[PDB]
Structure 1
């Protein structure tokens, strides 16, 4: 699994469950083409977005739909979504974990890159 996302909720002290996210890849004409999408499980994890063959070099954007997550819980948050934009596989294949911690007016994201 070369691209996985883990999301935690800092208000409830729990995984962030049912968070939708869309992944895009920058096309040669510099537009964002849809690449993969999914939602976090009961563990706050989203696996199986892509494969080693399909996950070629490029610039990728992970849009985490944090607004829909908070609204579904009856909370009005600040951000529309959280964005994680990065060049992937520039030096050969890597495995990426994107971790996110969500509050209504704040979020943090970090990346774990392994070879």
Structure 2
């Protein structure tokens, strides 16, 4: 007799971010990547990746180089932040 009641009545003007779910029940490589409900990626970097069985097995000569420079100003505000009657401002 499952039952879920969220936010059954709302008099007013909220700022809601609702997420949910109700559940009721030889050689091989694999990359499973299952994502979620909310996500905010900014400037994500995944430079190098070698995935599998026996990569670079013999005599592999790998030269990696990742120089990072440059003034990266992330002036951020109100991420995943539902607001009400509020004043979000970004100035420069």
Q: Which has the larger radius of gyration?
A: 2
Structure with a larger share of its residues in strand: 1
Shift of 1:91: 62
Say whether the 8 Å CA contact 1:94–1:113 is kept in structure 2: no
Q: Deviations over 1:9-62 (max 9, x none)?
A: 79745999995531347xxxxxxxxxxxxxxxxxxxxxx999999999999999
Tell me which of 42, 50, 60 is aligned to 2:38. Answer: 60
Contact 2:14/2:84 (<8 A) preserved:
no
> What's the CA shift for 1:100?
24
- The answer to whether the 8 A contact 1:99-1:110 is kept is yes
* TM-score, normalisation: structure 1: 0.12
- Extract unaligned runs of 5+ from structure 1: 26-47
Maintained 8 Å contact 2:78/2:88: yes
Where structure 2 has 5 or more consecutive residues not aligned to the other structure, the ranges are: none
Q: Secondary structure at the match of 2:49?
A: helix
Whose helix fraction is larger, Structure 1's or Structure 2's? 1
